Amino acid sequence: RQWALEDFEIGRPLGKGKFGNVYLAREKQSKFILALKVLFKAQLEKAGVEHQLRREVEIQSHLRHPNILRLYGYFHDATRVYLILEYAPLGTVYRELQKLSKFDEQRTATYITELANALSYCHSKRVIHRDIKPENLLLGSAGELKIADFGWSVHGTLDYLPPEMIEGRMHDEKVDLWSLGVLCYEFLVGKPPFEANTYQETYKRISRVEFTFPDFVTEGARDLISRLLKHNPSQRPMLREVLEHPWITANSSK
Template sequence: MNVQRTSPVSFLRNGRYKRIESDEPVSKCPRLSDSSGDAGYLSSLPGSPLWAAPFNGTPTHQGPSRIGQFLLIPIADRDGVYSALNVHTGDESLCKVFDMIQYQEKIRAHSVLPAHRNISHIKDIILGERKAYVFLEKDYGDMHMFVKSCKKLDEELASRLFYQVVSAVAHCHQAGIVLGDLKLRKFVFSNKKRTHLKLEGLEECHMLEEGNDSMSHKHGCPAYVSPEILNSSGSYSGKQADVWSLGVMLYTLLVGRYPFHDSDPSALFSKIRRGQFCLPDTLSPKAKCLIRSLLRKEPWERLSATEILIHPWFHSAQETGSGEQEASAADQTVPTFCLDDDESLFC
């Protein structure tokens, strides 16, 4: 097979960029013991021959598939995302599969966004005829599932995790990027102790022109949508809408349920438009202050992402504990917001 190698793209920091000729469907993955010595190998040496078992990126079967030296296993509840195992080195990573006509636009924000410790970066890209395989760092589960497995987080742990979330959002805003579909699922743990978070991708973000964050896009998770998006038929501030979503995330971390919850979409949106929510007495005054500063009906009254980072709640909450806490799975219960009335509303 003739395989064309291309030059590394500028935003692949310490990564590789490869091209394969075909990515037709395969019915199953061959047993590794049946593979020849160079089967599935994509050499990193310039000019080396490359080979890849065909793969279309959207298999109808749920078993593993093969692309180059990577074994791809679908991840439940994450469409187009696979756990990738390098069969030669044993290294694990994450693979996102995009149509070729879309992939450059999907990863374009990585080319302008400076590196940040709380944002995942692209390690490798393999291009087929119809699909692009984008490899990122392995993760250890997302925040949605973590909160779903816990009733709620204590303020010390919540402050450590939420600070990392806001740091990533502030970094994007400063670079002229609005995330637009902010939610707990967007943040994943990058270590086994589940103390370090990263924004797992920038596919749904919006790159601003000349600093103007006026937007009219209405896509997003219903549970996180801001009142002005529901009320306005025109434009709204993308950054301020992101801050509202941060408020929903913080409330959920500390209370164990969404601030606005209803299985009926119309009722849910009515509650969001009113902007009225209850704060438990168990929360500290500074935690209540921060939540109220984010979940304000009027967008211009909300803190900016940068201002959130200097809120005194972070300092006071972390004074109650020392060091990084490892999240325990023991005695964890499903929170009330995870009732199966309509999971699609609460993504």
């Protein structure tokens, strides 16, 4: 007996798919614009077990940072689950990548700075993500990056998974440093570093950490990406060392 669908006005469809739909919406009383993610119960319980996608609402809801999409709350009815999300007006980093082909150094460094900050905050809360793709990075009103509520897709690939995870071995917070490296590279080059024609060859490249730089990538960029993509998790840097890297501080606007 709290938040309910009747408390909202529904707008245009942001996305539709096998698991549900997402719509623009506005709270009747307040009239504030937001997004409403509608998930079909017949899918959660069936496969994506409600277990995995449940309490994670309480953990996610407790995350409050300018670079993390806010989850205001949630509610349900007989057949659906409703997530009340912050609305990101400028779209995904993914679409922007389709548009520009590749980003410049100033834009790449700023984005990495905003990500490292969100991730450092998440670590202090004992929250670790499992692969972050360009399509899961939304853009705020001022153009800032927002890491979207990890999970709850409506319908991450092998290209973004660190070695320890695809190999089945143990993984920890250092998985986030590897992600940072795949992204930095993708922003500057236009495609992820281990891309291949088959899952077979992709795995091989990720496993053996096989990547190369086009001629236009700078030594400063090449040095950061190289420090981040270390097969051994322990060799990867702390998030603080990334925020203080000479190439970041030199091209970032903070």
